[PDB]
Amino acid sequence: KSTVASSTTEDLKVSTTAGAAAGTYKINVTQLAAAQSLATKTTFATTKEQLG
């Protein structure tokens, strides 16, 4: 049970774990996942300055 996969677009990447069934799939990537980021409201003169 070994297969190989290929994609038309370079943006999408595809790899095949063992056990896949041969075929053709039509893929639409509506959204992308992003990770929350939090930044301090102020700015500090230098790192060595003690905050707390």
Binding site: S2, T3, V4, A5, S6, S7, T8, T9, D11, L12, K13, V14, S15, T16, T17, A18, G19, A20, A21, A22, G23, T24, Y25, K26, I27, N28, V29, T30, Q31, L32, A33
Partner: protein, 52 residues
């Protein structure tokens, strides 16, 4: 992450989708429309094992 494979809606927490269908790992880089992924069977591994 939100995508659509062969008319089935998939929602994941990351940009590496693994179980749609089970056995294919997709890495999403940017939004795509109507990409095609083709999976075809290869028998090279079995024939090399048999020959060895």
């Amino acid at each position: 992450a939100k995508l659509n494979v062969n008319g089935i809606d998939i929602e994941r927490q990351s940009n590496t989708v693994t179980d749609a269908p089970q056995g294919i790992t997709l890495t999403l880089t940017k939004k795509v429309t109507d990409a095609t992924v083709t999976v075809t069977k290869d028998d090279t591994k079995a024939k090399e094992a048999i020959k060895s």
